[PDB]
Design a protein around this ligand. Structure first.
Ligand code: O81
Ligand code: CL
Ligand code: MG
Ligand code: MG
Ligand code: MG
Length: 134
């Protein structure tokens, strides 16, 4: 069940999944609808689901990782798609080999240096590229 803010924006949560506390490498995953494109893992908040809880669930489902949830980075709107996304830092401590989206849709994942992540996100996901602005 998709949820919405009072203005009709879709409620979403996302994590910047870092390899370490240095935050130099981030995990991106393949788009479901276009598998040669990279996205930040994230998705819809469920009814009455806390954003931090939604972000951890979405990263487990889409990216097959777990770890230590850090700070909220910010709340980012995509006016074109009508999304409002809570974006958190996660430090990855567990990498699972056969996760929900790997089994269900063959979703891929890959470590990117921050500057390379921003580069591959820019064309199709410029708001996701802005998650890294800091
Ligand atoms: O395929 P696109 O370009 O139409 O974008 C897709 C995007 O696909 P992607 O970023 O993968 O290309 C999905 O993400 P996902 O299918 O990879 O999960 C994303 O859904 P979401 O991430 O908000 O939703 P869920 O992860 O499932 O909760 C939205 O899909 P949905 O609304 O069918 O759940 C988005 O569509 P809009 O909300 O209309 O922008
Ligand atoms: Cl790192
Ligand atoms: Mg989802
Ligand atoms: Mg999603
Ligand atoms: Mg999802």
């Amino acid at each position: 069940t998709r949820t919405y803010d009072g203005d009709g924006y879709k409620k979403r949560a996302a994590c910047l999944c870092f390899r370490s506390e240095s935050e130099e490498e981030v995990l991106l995953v393949s788009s479901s609808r276009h598998p040669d494109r990279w996205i930040v893992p994230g998705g819809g908040m469920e009814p009455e689901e806390e954003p931090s809880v939604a972000a951890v669930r979405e990263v487990c489902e889409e990216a097959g990782v777990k770890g230590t949830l850090g700070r909220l980075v910010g709340i980012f709107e995509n006016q074109e798609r009508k999304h409002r996304t809570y974006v958190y830092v996660l430090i990855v401590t567990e990498v699972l080999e056969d996760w929900e989206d790997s089994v269900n849709i063959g979703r891929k994942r890959e470590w990117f240096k921050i500057e390379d992540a921003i580069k591959v996100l820019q064309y199709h996901k410029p708001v996701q590229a802005s998650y890294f602005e800091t």
